[PDB]
Design a protein around this ligand. Structure first.
Ligand SMILES: Nc1ncnc2c1ncn2[C@@H]1O[C@H](COP(=O)(O)OP(=O)(O)OP(=O)(O)O)[C@@H](O)[C@H]1O
Ligand SMILES: Nc1ncnc2c1ncn2[C@@H]1O[C@H](COP(=O)(O)OP(=O)(O)O)[C@@H](O)[C@H]1O
Ligand SMILES: Nc1ncnc2c1ncn2[C@@H]1O[C@H](COP(=O)(O)OP(=O)(O)O)[C@@H](O)[C@H]1O
Ligand code: VO4
Ligand SMILES: [Mg+2]
Lengths: 1202, 751
């Protein structure tokens, strides 16, 4: 209320001067607010395109009357192709229109802002003058093309001069109008009965003009003229096909349906001063070409399917309906709708509609489309919630029925007000039936549109025409080779989630082939000449696009197919020497292995190079592969190498999309105030677009590392296709700058629709890409550097000690490949084991450092350190590769390690090695020496903090202390009540500088629990060179004990939001606060989780992307003898208040344990959900008997059993 | 009956009529209650019989013999077995077109039964022998109880205005429930316009529709108007609130509230009870289609242009009827369940109107050969009814119908709308000039509609009719530990499925061969699923012995396995929807045994034995990969390229197996409605016919247009025609029409 008006009053200077009376009247709120709203509405009524503008920018536009240079940012959204206005020297008279591609359109009569100071007045004048100037230039170009249209053997010079003189859309119109008049005249002349055909003359004229164009495109041209020739060649090939068909079918009359069904043009220049000179008619429709400047748009090949689409869409445009094409993904529905819209010269606004598009949003959009008379193509209209699909049916029907009064001002009912409806507007909806995340339309709405099925586009024709326009002399043979190649790849190769052999892939191959041809021409010219091997260029582009996504088994299949379709053709990949040396250097500064060919690290460098190629071609990427494959390192290395090679600073924004609600990822708009607040992705994109800090000159990489499901990805469908635009429910449109790449670092695409898979370039990272010894080399290289100076010296000689074991076929590799054959409570992934092993080896080095500190004289020499490290290696291998399995599997792994290795090992012949620790003197010491026969006080038995030492207790506590010293997150998984919380708290009570905070995870837990915990226990939010979240208690480390970590429910696409949040804030060390979108970095925060086995009811297996950073320790139920000792201790403790029951302390415990065993095998969780029997019951048993016995002084054994 | 059936589906009309007939029968004068026979009619299939089923003179099938020996239990039919084998005309009667019209007298009665007694006895005989006609006999039964023309108002178009002005009180809302693909809002918009009654229509949703609808109801009940709430099944809570609100309004008369909804089980029950239910459904039969199409189109709109316009609409209507009633035969007819709706007919009429106005500027008596046939045969094949068509086989079907109807030679006198409609009778084109003549021609249509009217074969509804009859009887009858079992099931399955199959050896020469690459991929996938299925069943066995515990996966697997649902884990190759676990397991055993035979053949020989084996296309994970691999093999064996290759198929029933160097054998293909006496097809009345050892040859393409007698038959994986493998070119025999092949839904099935 008050704040909004105060903010908007200060946005401009002259606005305070405007309406000066109310300035003191405000500084009665309802009347002022409604007066301002009515001012904005009547201003939008004066210039209808203001309805495309929001108030926050309309106020600027009206206020910035004097500074016209400010207006040159709002024109990109008020118009279709207009980008800037060409003004006079004093910026008082606008002289013309400038497209974003640099194609001026100079007004015949300039608008002088001096005599039309009001913004709406001269904006309307410039719109009208743009229409008039386009009409007049089209008339002149039509006359010019009529001069040499009726002739043969056109000289290329005059034709090229005409092409360069006039605008691209005007050129295309000129050629089609001339052809339409020629064919009308020929069929009229032969309409007086069957006679000789002057139609052959028109066919020959088209053929010779096409030959001229093909030769003109063989030689190098300026890029703008190259695009003009592209358009003309596509068009005239279409005209040639049409005329050839007419001659074949022997049409004699201008009224035959073989000619009426063709889309025809009629220019009547003597029309008296209106934009209605040009009339475009198909079978029975009749549209007046709207003179909207479209800059230079990319024309489509007019295939028979596109002709059917034109027929149906024009038929639906007649009778004031709407067009509703549908089909699989990537069949040209959106682009065909846009092609028709620009063909008639219509302002076409594309919207990508998601469920956030509601009744009010669609109503405001329709207000805009009606006031301006602009088309609307609502891509994915079935992604709205079916309630809103029903609700907006009322609005669509209101528009259509009110629009039919024109065929009979005219106004309709939209959002409880009357708006002017123009006949020019249309409504189109493109849909994907049967795809995930899609709603089902009401039958009320399906009758408001005309559906059209677009299932099999004519790909052969598209390939032939595109290659022919690109200058390939063998375009027909190339198309006949390439399209069957794709249909056979779709059949011979295995169907994968990331596999795409549709139309989008073929179009990408064709564009890359054209670029490769141009580059090869330039290279030859550095060293006419049109004997290039064109098939080699095709294989070049195909291997640059279809191979990066190939799985190991489908690579030989694709290459056999290439060898059988293009026999005798050889492919020779480039060397990329400069980028390769830059990559080698960067891999040196990041402790990463570099390789070439078959060397160690080869397949990885091939992967990063393929990634660079796909980055060059595409603007949406997906790095797909099992976790632990080097995707993140690949893209980071490439970003640094490109920064140091090309010299452009590379900035990356990593976002986890599933770690936040898409209301926070894209933003929202409150229903009441109708004010839009940005999300996370939108804020990044707006900062890039509004490059206040020069963000447009850098390499911006927005990476989405997370999970892909058709709920938030589809909001970027309009961003990953040729549109390159992000559409918001606010109606704002954000254009993707050319320096921005969008990538998705994902591990699979099982839950992604084909719609998003086709829009992105797939690079497949196998697990063989990142080999084991490559990780070992990284570990050792980081060890010999990066001090955890005497510390570094210990690290260096320890790494020297460990070297012979970390071999490609050494101890660790064989141990790990054998441990893959064991049974683990959680899925066993290589990186989890390796990470636990590396953290414990770091702890071993820290132990050596601590020892050397404890002996200022006589530090540990090379021999003692050698023995200690080479024994701690075996200890840590056993713990890492079997710390999540039962005792039998741990024993089996120990037996295998004893069988293979030559490290000195304990000599006891019948006990497992896991019972043995390594002392600082490098000797195998039994764990049994560390467990004494404790004597608990006769009080405080079964107390919360009392832990009776046990083998499995000391081993597990030592392991947990090792892991928690390096602040590494970890998880304890086991049956309920087995001692996870007890063991963890015992471990932490040894660490004096850590405070633990408990968190209880239910099925309905969201990252909000974590955020509240941080808001309470970490209330400092500091802002040094960034923002850091730190615990309030200085000098202490906050531990978050997250119990039942695998409990929160998976959504429909297999993602747990809080697990993704934790994984993000552990691996990337922080998160995003959805209040400022600023990255917040964790300081002194670590996590420990406790869970039950995934096999348990209500328990979900955790994601491997999460399991990499957290090793898992399996705490099982104490066995019979373990319980016997644990509770005999408590019994002997409590059976002391009455010194006559002493001899009963031993049977009683046994009795207790005996009963427990029976119950645990009688009433399982199979019978009832609550039949879980745990040592918590024995603890309650002892504590209960103790409470009973505490006050009494004497008691017979009968009372004890009672 | 009329008021109830106006709110029921056509399928349940016969059940309700049979119940009403029972009520009338029990209230008659002195005829027997006939409960002893109705008991056998309803629950006579549950009689347990071990080894008494014996066909006589091989004149009966197993099901027929079982049914007759079950029906022999009744006192009247104690002599069925002797009587059927003592009569020769019974064989003729069994294979008759409409046996229910004339049923032989086989029961023995001491007294001459009343006509209702004969009706029910013939009902039992029809149920025993020819259950396909059972439903068609059931109608006859009702005809003898409630009198014929009892179930006849339903065939007529619905009369909204009479019921709304008469049979509906203001308080009771008018519920209009539409099946998937239908809507009723247009009917009421037309009704309100015709009655000159102002109607306020609102779509329910978005929380503004609620406020607007409440305001509209409030103003309408005190003034007298019509209110529509469209698609009001997306706000069930507000719908409860509306049901509560209507009960206490006491509105002005002439007020009406119409609630348009889809048939979904989440509609409130109390609202259904407090309203008047009208079910809108695709018409039954072409006759009802035509009648309601004509009733929809105003008579003023017909015969405004020259009189030939009247005929156009008629053809149009007839055309629409066909493409509305081929949908009820979705596998054989329209291969996909298209939503050919009333908007299609409205748009077709609009285009016909506009183009016939343009072709003849008012002048009457336009020439039959001067009407713009082209402007309609293509706007309705490429823009109106072809707009919904996905594949090209349905498109060629639509084009066949259009080119056979919308032609100049339809204003003749001997033009035949349909052929072999009664096996020999041809539906003749009516010779009318005015609309009323065509309406009368429609109303005299015989009630012997068969799928042969639609172009489909006459046996395209046998399964559907039997299922309908069984459903009727089940509805009538309804209206009147697992651990041991799973252990036995899983043990039997594990015995049934063979053990794991051996892989294929990788040699230096085998790796290049495309056939070997495909076969290795198949054997590897088969071994992977074989290990998984076998160990899953072994885990279930151990769980059902009590030895092994319960896992979340084991829980899900067992839960969906006792119910007969095929587990999502096992489904990795394409299977028809609704496949049971038992059929799936038999199929899996067949596929694994085929892969085992392949593995032994490959072990015996690497190159000379992977091409001389006959591969079952039905029992193959990816048969498209096999086709591509064979093509690639022929391309590599010679200098030919992949693109310059085409398929020629030759059926070799002799099993001589004289395979050429470019020929691959395939077994297990099934023609749907044609036989191959040679490599030439021929239309037949059998549902499917096995093709033994079709040879596939890859020959270099000549880019020559095929002959007239050659037809392009799709090949699908299974009966669910939802996936194309490839297409075959079969030459047809002499005196055959490829259009008849297209209409009769001839195809080839792998499974
Ligand atoms: N060239 C390399 N040489 C050695 N180790 C490498 C190399 N590239 C990556 N690694 C290591 O491999 C491990 C996993 O790779 P990385 O961190 O790049 O992510 P990823 O497994 O591809 O994906 P994500 O983190 O998304 O699951 C890390 O420990 C990383 O240090
Ligand atoms: N007939 C055609 N000629 C040229 N390009 C085409 C044709 N059909 C599709 N494309 C291209 O393929 C891509 C398909 O994009 P889109 O129009 O969004 O298809 P869909 O809507 O089916 O996903 C576009 O980049 C378009 O340029
Ligand atoms: N060796 C032991 N010493 C002391 N208490 C034990 C021992 N083993 C089991 N317990 C008892 O088992 C219970 C385990 O509880 P806790 O560890 O808090 O939950 P969870 O095991 O589910 O994480 C504790 O109450 C503890 O008293
Ligand atoms: O067919 V799509 O426009 O959803 O890529
Ligand atoms: Mg699209």
């Amino acid at each position: 209320r008050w704040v909004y008006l105060e903010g908007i009053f200060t946005g401009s200077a002259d606005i305070k001067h405007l309406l000066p009376v109310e300035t003191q009247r405000f500084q009665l709120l309802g009347k002022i607010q409604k007066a301002l709203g009515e001012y904005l509405e009547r201003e939008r009524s004066s210039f209808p395109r203001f309805y495309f503008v929001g108030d926050e920018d309309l106020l600027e536009i009206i206020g910035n009357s004097k500074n016209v240079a400010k207006l040159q940012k709002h024109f990109k959204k008020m118009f279709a192709g207009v980008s800037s206005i060409i003004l006079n020297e004093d910026n008082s008279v606008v002289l013309g229109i400038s497209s974003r591609e640099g194609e001026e359109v100079m007004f015949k009569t300039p608008v002088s802002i001096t005599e039309h100071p009001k913004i709406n007045e001269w904006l309307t004048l410039v719109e009208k003058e743009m229409r008039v100037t386009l009409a007049k230039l089209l008339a002149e170009s039509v006359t010019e093309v009529e001069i040499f249209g009726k002739a043969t053997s056109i000289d290329p010079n005059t034709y090229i001069t005409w092409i360069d003189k006039y605008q691209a859309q005007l050129v295309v119109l000129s050629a089609q109008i001339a052809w339409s008049e020629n064919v009308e005249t020929a069929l009229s002349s032969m309409g007086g009965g069957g006679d000789a055909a002057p139609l052959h003359s028109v066919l020959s004229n088209v053929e010779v003009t096409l030959n001229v164009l093909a030769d003109s495109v063989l030689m190098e041209q300026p890029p703008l003229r190259r695009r003009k020739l592209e358009h003309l060649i596509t068009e005239l090939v279409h005209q040639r096909d049409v005329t050839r068909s007419l001659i074949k079918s022997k049409i004699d009359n201008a009224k035959s349906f073989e000619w009426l069904s063709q889309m025809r043009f009629y220019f009547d220049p003597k029309q008296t001063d209106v934009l209605q000179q040009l009339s475009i008619q198909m079978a029975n429709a009749k549209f007046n070409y709207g003179f909207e400047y479209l800059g230079v748009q990319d024309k489509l090949v007019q295939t028979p399917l596109t002709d059917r689409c034109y027929l149906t869409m024009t038929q639906a445009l007649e009778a004031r309906l709407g067009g509703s094409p549908f089909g699989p993904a990537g069949t040209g529905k959106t682009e065909s709708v846009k092609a028709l819209g620009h063909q008639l010269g219509r302002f076409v606004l594309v919207f990508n509609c998601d469920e956030t598009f509601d009744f009010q949003a669609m109503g405001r959009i329709f207000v805009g489309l009606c006031q301006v008379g602009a088309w609307g193509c609502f891509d994915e209209f079935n992604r709205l919630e079916e309630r809103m699909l029903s609700a907006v049916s009322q609005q669509v029907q209101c528009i259509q029925e009110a629009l039919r009064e024109h065929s009979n001002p005219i106004t309709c009912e939209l959002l409880n007000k009357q708006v002017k409806v123009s006949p020019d507007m249309a409504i189109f909806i493109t849909m994907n039936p049967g795809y995930a995340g899609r709603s089902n339309l009401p039958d009320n709405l399906k009758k408001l549109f005309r559906s059209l099925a677009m299932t099999k586009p004519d790909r052969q024709l598209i390939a032939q025409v595109m290659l022919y326009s690109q200058g390939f002399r063998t375009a027909e043979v190339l198309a006949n080779k390439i399209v069957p190649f794709f249909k056979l790849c779709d059949e011979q190769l295995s169907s994968q989630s990331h596999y795409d052999f549709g139309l989008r892939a073929l179009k990408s191959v064709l564009v890359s082939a054209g670029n490769v041809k141009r580059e090869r021409i330039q290279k030859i010219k550095r060293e006419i000449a049109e004997n290039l091997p064109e098939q080699e260029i095709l294989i070049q582009s195909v291997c640059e696009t279809m191979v990066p996504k190939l799985v190991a088994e489908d690579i030989p299949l694709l290459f056999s197919l290439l060898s059988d379709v293009f026999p005798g053709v050889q492919y020779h990949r480039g060397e990329m020497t400069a980028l390769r040396e830059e990559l080698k250097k960067v891999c040196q500064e990041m402790y990463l292995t570099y390789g070439d060919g078959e060397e160690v690290g080869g397949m990885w460098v091939e992967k990063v190079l393929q990634l660079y190629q796909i980055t060059q071609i595409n603007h949406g990427l997906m790095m797909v592969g099992p976790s632990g494959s080097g995707k993140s390192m690949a893209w980071r290395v490439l970003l640094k190498a490109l920064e140091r090679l090309e010299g452009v600073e590379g900035v990356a924004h990593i976002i986890d999309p599933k770690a936040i609600s898409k209301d926070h990822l894209y933003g929202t708009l409150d229903p009441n105030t109708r004010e839009w607040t940005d999300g996370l992705f939108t804020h990044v994109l707006r900062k890039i677009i509004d490059s206040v800090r020069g963000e447009l000159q850098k390499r911006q990489w927005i990476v989405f590392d997370g999970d892909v499901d058709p709920e938030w990805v589809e909001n970027l469908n309009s961003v990953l296709d040729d549109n390159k635009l992000l559409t918001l429910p606010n109606g704002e449109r954000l254009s993707l700058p050319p320096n921005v790449r969008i990538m998705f670092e994902v591990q699979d695409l099982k839950y992604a629709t084909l719609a998003t898979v086709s829009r992105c370039g797939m690079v497949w990272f196998s697990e063989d890409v990142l080999s084991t010894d490559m990780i070992f080399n990284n570990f050792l290289a980081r060890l010999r550097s990066i001090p955890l100076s005497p510390m570094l010296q210990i690290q260096r000689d320890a790494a020297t000690i460990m070297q012979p074991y970390f071999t490609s076929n050494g101890l660790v590799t064989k141990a790990l490949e054998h441990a893959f054959q064991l049974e683990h409570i959680m899925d066993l992934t290589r990186l989890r084991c390796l990470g636990s092993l590396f953290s414990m080896l770091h702890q071993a080095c820290r132990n050596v450092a601590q020892y050397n500190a404890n002996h200022p004289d006589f530090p540990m020499q090379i021999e003692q350190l050698e023995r200690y490290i080479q024994r701690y290696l075996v200890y840590a291998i056993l713990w890492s590769l079997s710390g999540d399995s039962r005792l039998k599997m741990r024993a089996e792994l120990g037996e295998y390690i004893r069988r293979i290795t030559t490290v000195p090992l304990p000599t006891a012949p019948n006990i497992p090695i896991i019972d043995y620790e390594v002392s600082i003197s490098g000797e195998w010491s039994p764990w049994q020496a560390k467990v004494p026969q404790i004597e608990v006080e006769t009080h405080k038995v079964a107390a919360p903090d009392v832990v009776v030492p046990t083998l499995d207790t000391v081993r597990h506590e030592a392991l947990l202390y090792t892991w928690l010293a390096e602040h590494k997150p970890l998880v304890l998984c086991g049956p309920p009540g087995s001692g996870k919380t007890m063991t963890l708290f015992s471990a932490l009570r040894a660490l004096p500088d850590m405070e633990v905070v408990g968190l209880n995870f239910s099925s309905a837990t969201t990252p909000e629990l974590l955020l509240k915990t941080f808001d309470h226990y970490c209330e400092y939010r500091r802002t040094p060179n960034g923002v850091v979240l730190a615990p309030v208690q200085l000098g202490k480390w906050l531990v978050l004990f997250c119990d039942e970590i695998n409990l929160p429910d998976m959504d429909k696409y297999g993602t747990q939001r809080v697990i993704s949040f934790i994984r993000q804030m552990v691996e990337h060390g922080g998160f995003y606060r959805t209040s400022d979108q600023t990255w917040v970095k964790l300081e002194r925060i670590q996590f420990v989780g406790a869970c039950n086995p995934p096999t348990d009811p209500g328990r979900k297996p955790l994601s491997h992307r999460f399991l990499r950073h957290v090793p898992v320790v399996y705490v099982d139920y104490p066995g019979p003898a373990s319980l016997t000792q644990i509770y005999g201790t408590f019994n002997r403790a409590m059976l002391r208040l009455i010194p006559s029951l002493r001899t009963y302390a031993e049977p009683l415990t046994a009795a207790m344990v005996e009963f427990y065993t029976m119950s645990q095998e009688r009433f399982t969780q199979d019978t009832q959900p609550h039949y879980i029997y745990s040592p918590r019951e024995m603890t309650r048993w002892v504590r209960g008997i103790f409470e009973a016995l505490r006050p009494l002084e004497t008691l017979p054994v009968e009372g004890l059993i009672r | 009956f009329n008021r109830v059936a106006r709110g029921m589906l056509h399928q349940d009309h016969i059940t309700f009529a049979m119940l009403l007939a029972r009520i009338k029968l029990k209230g008659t004068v002195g005829e027997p209650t006939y409960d002893a026979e109705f008991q056998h009619f309803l629950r006579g299939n549950e009689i347990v019989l071990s080894a008494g089923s014996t066909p006589r003179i091989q004149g009966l099938t197993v099901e027929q013999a079982e049914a007759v020996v079950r029906l022999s239990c009744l006192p009247a039919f104690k002599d069925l077995i002797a009587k059927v084998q003592a009569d020769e005309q019974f064989g003729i009667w069994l294979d008759s077109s409409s046996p229910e019209q004339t049923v032989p007298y086989l029961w023995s009665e001491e007294t001459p039964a009343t006509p209702i007694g004969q009706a029910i006895h013939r009902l039992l005989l029809i149920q025993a022998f020819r259950p396909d006609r059972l439903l068609a006999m059931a109608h006859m039964f009702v005809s003898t109880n409630l009198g014929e023309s009892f179930m006849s108002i339903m065939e007529q178009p619905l009369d909204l205005t009479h019921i709304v002005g008469t049979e509906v009180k203001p308080n009771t809302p008018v519920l209009m429930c539409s099946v998937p693909g239908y809507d009723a809002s247009g009917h009421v918009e037309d009704l309100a316009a015709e009655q000159n009654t102002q109607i306020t229509s609102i779509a329910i949703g978005s929380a503004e529709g609620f406020n607007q609808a409440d305001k509209a109801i409030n103003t309408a009940v005190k003034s007298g108007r019509w209110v529509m709430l469209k698609n009001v099944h997306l706000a069930p809570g507000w719908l409860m609130q509306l049901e509560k609100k209507l009960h206490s309004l006491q509105p002005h008369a002439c007020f009406r509230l119409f609630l348009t909804m889809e048939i979904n089980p989440k509609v409130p029950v109390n609202l259904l009870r407090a309203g008047r239910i009208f079910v809108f459904e695709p018409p039954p039969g072409v006759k009802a289609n035509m009648l309601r199409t004509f009733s929809s189109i105003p008579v003023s709109r017909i015969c405004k242009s020259p009189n030939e316009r009247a005929r156009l609409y008629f053809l149009l209507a007839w055309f629409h009827a066909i493409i509305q009633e081929r949908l009820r035969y979705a596998p054989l007819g329209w291969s996909k369940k298209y939503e050919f709706g009333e908007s299609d007919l409205r748009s077709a009429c609009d285009t016909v109107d506009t183009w016939l106005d343009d072709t003849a500027k008012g002048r009457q008596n336009i020439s039959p050969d001067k009407i713009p046939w082209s402007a309609l045969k293509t706007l309705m094949a490429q823009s109106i009814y072809g707009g919904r068509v996905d594949n090209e086989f349905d498109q060629r079907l639509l084009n066949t119908f259009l080119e056979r109807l919308f032609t100049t030679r339809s204003f003749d006198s001997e033009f035949k709308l349909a052929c072999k409609v009664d096996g020999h009778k041809d539906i003749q084109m009516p010779d009318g000039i005015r609309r009323e003549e065509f309406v009368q021609w429609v109303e005299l249509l015989p009630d012997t509609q068969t799928p042969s009217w639609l172009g489909l074969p006459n046996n395209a509804e046998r399964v559907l009719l039997t299922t309908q009859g069984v459903d009727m009887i089940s509805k009538m009858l309804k209206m009147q530990a697992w651990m041991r079992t799973l252990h036995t099931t899983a043990s039997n399955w594990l015995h049934l499925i063979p053990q794991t199959l051996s892989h294929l050896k990788r040699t230096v020469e085998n790796i290049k061969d495309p056939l070997f690459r495909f076969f290795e991929r198949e054997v590897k996938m088969g071994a992977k699923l074989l290990q998984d299925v076998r160990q899953d069943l072994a885990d279930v066995v151990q769980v059902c012995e009590g030895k092994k515990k319960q896992t979340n996966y084991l829980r899900t697997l067992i839960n969906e396995l006792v119910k007969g649902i095929l587990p999502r884990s096992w489904s990795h190759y394409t299977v028809p929807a609704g496949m049971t676990v038992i059929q799936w397991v038999s199929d899996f055993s067949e596929r694994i045994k085929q892969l085992q035979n392949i593995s032994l053949a490959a072990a015996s020989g690497g190159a000379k034995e992977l091409k001389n084996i006959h591969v079952c296309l039905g029992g193959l994970f990816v048969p498209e990969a096999y086709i591509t691999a064979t093509r690639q093999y022929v391309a590599q064996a010679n200098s030919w390229s992949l693109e310059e290759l085409c398929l020629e198929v030759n059926v070799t029933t002799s099993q001589g197996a004289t395979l050429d160097a470019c020929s691959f054998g395939v077994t297990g293909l099934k023609l749907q409605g044609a036989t191959c006496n040679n490599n030439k097809l021929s239309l037949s009345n059998a549902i499917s016919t096995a093709l033994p050892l079709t040879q596939l040859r890859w020959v270099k393409q000549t880019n020559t247009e095929k002959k007239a007698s050659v037809v392009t038959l799709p090949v699908y994986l299974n009966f669910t025609r939802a996936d194309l493998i490839f297409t075959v070119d079969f030459e047809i025999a002499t005196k055959e029409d490829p259009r008849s092949f297209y209409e009769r839904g001839v195809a080839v099935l792998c499974t």
